[PDB]
Enzyme design. Structure first.
Site, PDB file in Angstrom:
ATOM      1  N   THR A  40      -1.631 -29.440  62.175  1.00 27.73           N
ATOM      2  CA  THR A  40      -3.073 -29.684  61.863  1.00 27.73           C
ATOM      3  C   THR A  40      -2.867 -30.491  60.592  1.00 27.73           C
ATOM      4  OG1 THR A  40      -2.767 -27.639  60.930  1.00 27.73           O
ATOM      5  CG2 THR A  40      -4.034 -27.696  62.869  1.00 27.73           C
TER       6      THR A  40
ATOM      7  N   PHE B 103     -11.477 -24.784  58.382  1.00 29.72           N
ATOM      8  CA  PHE B 103     -10.695 -23.776  58.370  1.00 29.72           C
ATOM      9  C   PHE B 103     -11.034 -22.368  59.002  1.00 29.72           C
ATOM     10  CE2 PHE B 103      -9.293 -26.949  54.994  1.00 29.72           C
ATOM     11  CZ  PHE B 103      -8.123 -27.019  55.421  1.00 29.72           C
TER      12      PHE B 103
ATOM     13  N   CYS C 232      -8.241 -19.618  58.147  1.00 32.97           N
ATOM     14  CA  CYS C 232      -6.888 -20.142  57.873  1.00 32.97           C
ATOM     15  C   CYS C 232      -6.158 -19.650  56.431  1.00 32.97           C
ATOM     16  CB  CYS C 232      -6.702 -21.746  57.828  1.00 32.97           C
ATOM     17  SG  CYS C 232      -5.069 -22.336  57.556  1.00 32.97           S
TER      18      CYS C 232
END
Ligand code: HEM
Length: 448
Positions: free
Chosen positions: A261, A386, A393
């Site tokens: 990512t 996120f 995340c």
């Protein structure tokens, strides 16, 4: 209200709509036509795709909704196990690992990783400095070299040495193919063969990591990296450490989640910069102003504010993990008009959320980092690259520090040319990236 639903195919319902190279981009177009919510049926299952801040702010209510494992994460779980990203919130190992690993992403922590991030960044800059006159750069390819190596080194003191190679480490080969297999299952004895490739790829990852682990354990060498925490750390709650099986799943999880990512983000950022030369120039001016030493300090990276805004604007338009799944904890009503039953699934379509005109204004397709000048002005749950809440995340600070450092150094050291007038083509795996994006870099001749 009864929600819209896209075109059906008899017994298959909407399933064949996901039979395409670019399913996320297909779903975005569907959202454009149908609006903030739509039902998506397949044989055996249903989910509801959300695209508006108005409804996503409710989906993000942790008292009402928890993280669900998509069919995709479920397939990934076959090699990521109960690592953080593929575990349910209610599994003992999720909370344990979460408590034990959180500190590995503290401020004291990014400071500790900084030096090794610079080690890989410098290798990137030297590669580009060493190109001959009319050669070019394969951007995502090189960004993936950087992000993979950075997580390997910072995370576990392992050097993939990606910049010494033309082809992939035998890990990514095993890994990509596994993810490939994993994704593929989405649509499916004819198939006895892929299983052996799969089990063999799986075997590659584990054996390495498992040696990477007992190697460290034995020597007893003294570190403070991610591995160090996975090996020594104790959950304050249970008082227990992770076991060796979960430790390996965490390494596999971070190696994967810890680079794909991030490479995407750097690739999209550079793409938007070359397509918008006034923005590139403004960011280059900050880099030159701030990065006054041969290699960046941690404090200097924190001062690259406009670079940070460029990265958030790239995440707005093309968030590289573009969707996450939720389930209803109890019966509840969504947005005042959509009754939900316990267990019902939602999908958050992040790229559509980030294009909600009621939030961002009419110019949502334009790349304007200045939108991020005053972050306090952004309503709750309007920007979610996120993810959400306790299942957000854990690597967010790591990803952004690495990206800001690297893009800062890039802008300090080279001028960039979009020599092919590249036409954006977004390849979808479990993440997104601009396939075939190339540039030329002209050195400013500033030594390291
Ligand atoms: C720009 C880069 C990245 C983006 C856009 C991103 C995005 C996300 C998103 C959206 C989630 C939520 C997933 C879900 O709800 O199903 C997530 C979770 C997670 N990410 Fe990241 N990620 C990035 C980089 C990283 C890095 C560098 C690491 C590790 C160093 C990492 C490790 C994880 C882990 C372990 C989880 C699951 C955490 C938990 O559920 O406890 N990610 N990420």
């Amino acid at each position: 209200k009864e929600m819209p639903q896209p075109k059906t195919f008899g017994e298959l319902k909407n399933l064949p709509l996901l039979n395409t190279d670019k399913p996320v981009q297909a779903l975005m177009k569907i959202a454009d036509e149908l609006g903030e919510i739509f039902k998506f049926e397949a044989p055996g299952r249903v989910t509801r795709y959300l695209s508006s801040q108005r409804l996503i702010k409710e989906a993000c209510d942790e008292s009402r909704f928890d993280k669900n494992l998509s069919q995709a994460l479920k397939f990934v779980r076959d090699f990521a196990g109960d690592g953080l990203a593929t575990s349910w919130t209610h599994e003992k190992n999720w909370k344990k690992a979460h408590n034990i690993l959180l500190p590995s992403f503290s401020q004291q922590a990014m400071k500790g990783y900084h030096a090794m991030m610079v080690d890989i960044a410098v290798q990137l800059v030297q590669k580009w400095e060493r190109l001959n006159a009319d050669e070019h750069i394969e951007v995502p390819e090189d960004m993936t070299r950087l992000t993979l190596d950075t997580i390997g080194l910072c995370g576990f003191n392992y050097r993939f040495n990606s910049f010494y190679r033309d082809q992939p480490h035998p890990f990514i080969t095993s890994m990509v193919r596994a993810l490939d297999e994993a994704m593929n299952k989405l649509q499916r004895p004819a198939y006895d063969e892929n299983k052996r490739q799969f089990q063999e790829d799986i075997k590659v990852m584990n054996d390495l990591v498992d040696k990477i682990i007992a190697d460290r354990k034995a020597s007893g060498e003294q570190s403070d990296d991610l591995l160090a925490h996975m090996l020594n750390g104790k959950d304050p709650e249970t008082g227990e450490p992770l076991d060796d099986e979960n430790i390996r799943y965490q390494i596999i999880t971070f190696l994967i989640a810890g680079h794909e990512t991030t490479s995407g983000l750097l690739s999209f950022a550079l793409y938007f910069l070359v397509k918008n030369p006034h923005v590139l120039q403004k960011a280059a001016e900050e880099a030159a102003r701030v990065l006054v030493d041969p290699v960046p300090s941690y404090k200097q990276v924190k001062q690259l504010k406009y670079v940070g805004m460029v990265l958030n604007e790239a995440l707005r338009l093309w968030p590289t993990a573009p969707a996450f799944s939720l389930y209803a904890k109890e019966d509840t009503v969504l947005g005042g008009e959509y009754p939900l039953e316990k267990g019902d699934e939602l999908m958050v379509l992040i790229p559509q959320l980030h294009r909600d005109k009621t939030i961002w204004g009419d110019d949502v397709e334009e790349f304007r980092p200045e939108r991020f000048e005053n972050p306090s002005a952004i309503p709750q749950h309007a920007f979610k690259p996120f993810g959400n809440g306790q299942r957000a995340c854990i690597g967010q600070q790591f990803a952004l520090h690495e990206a800001t450092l690297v893009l800062g150094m890039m802008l300090k050291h080279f001028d960039f040319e979009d020599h092919t007038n590249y036409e954006l083509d977004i390849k979808e795996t479990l993440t997104l990236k601009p396939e075939g994006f190339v540039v030329k870099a002209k050195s400013k001749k500033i030594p390291l």
